[PDB]
Amino acid sequence: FPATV
Amino acid sequence: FPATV
Amino acid sequence: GAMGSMERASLIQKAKLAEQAERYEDMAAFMKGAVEKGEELSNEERCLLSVAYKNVVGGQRAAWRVLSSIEQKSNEEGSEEKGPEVREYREKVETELQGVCDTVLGLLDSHLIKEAGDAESRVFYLKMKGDYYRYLAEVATGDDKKRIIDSARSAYQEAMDISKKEMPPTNPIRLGLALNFSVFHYEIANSPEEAISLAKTTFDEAMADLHTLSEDSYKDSTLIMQLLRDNLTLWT
Amino acid sequence: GAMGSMERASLIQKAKLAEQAERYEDMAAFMKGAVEKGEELSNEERCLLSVAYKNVVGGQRAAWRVLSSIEQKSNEEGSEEKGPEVREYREKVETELQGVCDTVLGLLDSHLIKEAGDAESRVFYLKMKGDYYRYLAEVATGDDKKRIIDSARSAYQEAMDISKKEMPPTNPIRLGLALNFSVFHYEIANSPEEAISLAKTTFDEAMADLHTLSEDSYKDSTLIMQLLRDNLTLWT
Ligand SMILES: CC(C)Oc1ccc([C@H](N)O)c2cc(C(=N)N)sc12
Ligand SMILES: CC(C)Oc1ccc([C@H](N)O)c2cc(C(=N)N)sc12
Ligand SMILES: *SCCNC(=O)C(C)(C)Oc1ccc(Cl)cc1
Ligand SMILES: *SCCNC(=O)C(C)(C)Oc1ccc(Cl)cc1
Ligand SMILES: [Mg+2]
Ligand SMILES: [Mg+2]
Ligand SMILES: [Mg+2]
Ligand SMILES: [Mg+2]
Ligand SMILES: [Mg+2]
Ligand SMILES: [Mg+2]
Numbered sequence: 001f002p003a004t005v
Numbered sequence: 006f007p008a009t010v
Numbered sequence: 011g012a013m014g015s016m017e018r019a020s021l022i023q024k025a026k027l028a029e030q031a032e033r034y035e036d037m038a039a040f041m042k043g044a045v046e047k048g049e050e051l052s053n054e055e056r057c058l059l060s061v062a063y064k065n066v067v068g069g070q071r072a073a074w075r076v077l078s079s080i081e082q083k084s085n086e087e088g089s090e091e092k093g094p095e096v097r098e099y100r101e102k103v104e105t106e107l108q109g110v111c112d113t114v115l116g117l118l119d120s121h122l123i124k125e126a127g128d129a130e131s132r133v134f135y136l137k138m139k140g141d142y143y144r145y146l147a148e149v150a151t152g153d154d155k156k157r158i159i160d161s162a163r164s165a166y167q168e169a170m171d172i173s174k175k176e177m178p179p180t181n182p183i184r185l186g187l188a189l190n191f192s193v194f195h196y197e198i199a200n201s202p203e204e205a206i207s208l209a210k211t212t213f214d215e216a217m218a219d220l221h222t223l224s225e226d227s228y229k230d231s232t233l234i235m236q237l238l239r240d241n242l243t244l245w246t
Numbered sequence: 247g248a249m250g251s252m253e254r255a256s257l258i259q260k261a262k263l264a265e266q267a268e269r270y271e272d273m274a275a276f277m278k279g280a281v282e283k284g285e286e287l288s289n290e291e292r293c294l295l296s297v298a299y300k301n302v303v304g305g306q307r308a309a310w311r312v313l314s315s316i317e318q319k320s321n322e323e324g325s326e327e328k329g330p331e332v333r334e335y336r337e338k339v340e341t342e343l344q345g346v347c348d349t350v351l352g353l354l355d356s357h358l359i360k361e362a363g364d365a366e367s368r369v370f371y372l373k374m375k376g377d378y379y380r381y382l383a384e385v386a387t388g389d390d391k392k393r394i395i396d397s398a399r400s401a402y403q404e405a406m407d408i409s410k411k412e413m414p415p416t417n418p419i420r421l422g423l424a425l426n427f428s429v430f431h432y433e434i435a436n437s438p439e440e441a442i443s444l445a446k447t448t449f450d451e452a453m454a455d456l457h458t459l460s461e462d463s464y465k466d467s468t469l470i471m472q473l474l475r476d477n478l479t480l481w482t
Contacts, residue, residue, distance in 0.1 A: 002193050002244055003237040004141070005186040007429050007480055008473040009377070010422040023331045027316065031309035031339070073267035080263065095259045103267070 013043025021047075025058050034065035038110075045117045050125055056134050063114050067145055070107040074149060077103060104149050111142045118142075129176035130183060136169035137187040140194065147198050159198055166191040179215040180223060185234035188212040189241070196245065206245055213238045249279025257283075261294050270301035274346075281353045286361055292370050299350050303381055306343040310385060313339060340385050347378045354378075365412035366419060372405035373423040376430065383434050395434055402427040415451040416459060421470035424448040425477070432481065442481055449474045 013021055021044040028037035041059040045051065051059065077100040083089065084096050118139050126132040143162035150158045170191060173184040188208055196205035216235050220228055249257055257280040264273035277295040281287065287295065313336040319325065320332050354375050362368040379398035386394045406427060409420040424444055432441035452471050456464055 002196065002241045004190045004193050005234065005237065007432065007477045009426045009429050010470065010473065020329070020331050023328070024335050027313060027332065027335050030316070031312040032305075033309050033339070036335075036338075069268075073269050076267040077263060080266070092259070093256070095256050096263065099260050099263050099272075102272075103269070 011046050016043060018044055018047045022055060034062055037062035038066050042117060045122065053130060060138060067107060067110050070103060070110065071145060074103050074107060107149060108146060111146050114142045115139060129172055133169045133173045133183050133187060136165050137190060140166035141190055144194050144198055162194055166194060178219055180219045180231040182230050182234050185212065185216060185231060189234060189237055202245060209238045209242050247282050252279060254280055254283045258291060270298055273298035274302050278353060289366060296374060303343060303346050306339060306346065307381060310339050310343060343385060344382060347382050350378045351375060365408055369405045369409045369419050369423060372401050373426060376402035377426055380430050380434055398430055402430060414455055416455045416467040418466050418470050421448065421452060421467060425470060425473055438481060445474045445478050
């Protein structure tokens with residue numbers, strides 16, 4: 001999965 | 006901590 | 011409101027303790043209680059609220075993905091019928107996830123966003139609104155799916171508009187908003203080119219503004235810029 | 247019983263799914279429902295019950311230790327008064343932990359132990375009874391603390407007596423019982439010599455019986471024997 005914050 | 010199962 | 015009898019300051023203090031103890035459901039309940047006191051939140055308090063719910067919903071999303079994968083495999087050809095249980099349990103986790111998202115969106119709508127006038131608070135809350143609609147979109151399949159996606163898009167877009175007018179390109183909230191909206195484009199809106207363009211332009215504009223920053227601010231900004239780069243590497 | 251309307255087999259199936267999704271509270275609730283159907287549990291079902299509650303209570307214990315450490319530091323000299331909140335939140339987690347332990351002990355008493363006649367089931371359940379009284383003892387400070395410790399000791403001792411008569415020295419349940427009873431001696435009963443003696447004798451008697459085992463049984467037994475050795479290394 002891609003990075004999110 | 007010591008090991009328990 | 012089960013936290014109605016506890017002092018605001020005590021709720022914040024216990025949220026911090028719950029974080030130290032990795033008790034994120036408790037942390038979220040304490041922060042919900044703090045929000046429901048009706049006062050605006052400080053920068054640190056907004057972080058506590060976001061950390062708490064990000065961890066709760068993140069665990070739910072991870073579990074939903076495991077169960078959805080099992081359910082998909084159970085529906086392939088040659089698979090042996092195992093009954094309604096996988097679907098039922100995936101639905102249970104899904105309904106709990108939706109409940110958490112609805113709770114967060116409810117706090118944002120009643121009344122955090124409407125009282126947030128500074129860019130650092132308003133952008134942060136609108137980003138959260140986009141994020142929680144995005145998590146609803148990940149599990150949505152009904153008549154309202156397009157409206158859920160559009161609600162995420164609209165919140166992110168309002169946050170973006172404010173952030174570009176009122177924040178420097180290295181502001182970590184602006185960067186994190188762009189990171190997440192780019193992920194929205196890639197994973198939710200089937201717009202990988204928009205996702206890539208947004209991540210790249212955000213990264214490049216931040217790079218050009220790093221020269222203005224102290225060492226500590228530089229560390230904060232470059233941390234998020236690296237996440238943009240990580241996603242670009244995944245996608246290209 | 248909230249799980250009263252769900253089939254036993256469906257509860258077991260969902261417990262396995264919950265384990266795959268790392269949803270241990272759900273797993274425990276499903277296994278509690280299965281136990282409450284009133285039938286005996288198979289070897290695999292006993293494992294599911296134990297894994298579920300071990301993970302739930304293990305997380306509670308870890309959180310309790312974090313909070314207890316903060317509370318101890320808040321009571322040292324030179325520490326600034328921070329109010330009742332640390333104690334209150336430690337007490338909240340403690341009460342939840344005690345509730346889980348009481349639930350497990352209740353399932354064992356109503357009526358798993360009394361129907362367990364084979365050594366593999368009876369030893370396993372009596373070991374669990376010792377374990378959950380041990381977790382109660384870790385947090386106990388009242389008039390009943392010595393009785394809680396003695397309840398753990400008594401359950402472990404009955405399990406030990408059966409295990410030595412009815413199981414080979416390499417049986418993994420016998421080994422795990424001895425591992426945990428040794429930890430009880432060291433951490434709860436202030437009996438480090440008994441803890442060390444038990445771990446060493448258990449290890450040596452298992453070593454001498456490994457020659458009787460298949461490759462797969464050997465792997466199972468040596469895994470637990472290594473935990474005994476690890477504790478001996480910690481303690482000597
Ligand atoms: C100081 C205020 C504005 O709030 C933060 C700023 C930076 C951080 C992190 N250290 O960069 C942080 C972590 C937090 C937490 N997890 N409780 S609150 C928080
Ligand atoms: C086959 C039956 C008697 O039950 C087990 C035996 C061995 C194991 C482990 N693989 O050694 C195991 C793990 C389990 C789980 N966590 N759901 S049940 C289980
Ligand atoms: S608000 C929680 C504290 N911040 C963080 O954990 C990191 C990820 C380091 O910074 C950001 C979080 C959220 C945003 Cl919108 C931006 C940076
Ligand atoms: S019952 C859960 C499956 N078993 C295990 O996870 C390990 C730790 C490998 O084996 C034992 C667990 C419990 C006992 Cl009493 C003995 C071995
Ligand atoms: Mg007040
Ligand atoms: Mg649904
Ligand atoms: Mg644009
Ligand atoms: Mg029936
Ligand atoms: Mg108490
Ligand atoms: Mg003896």
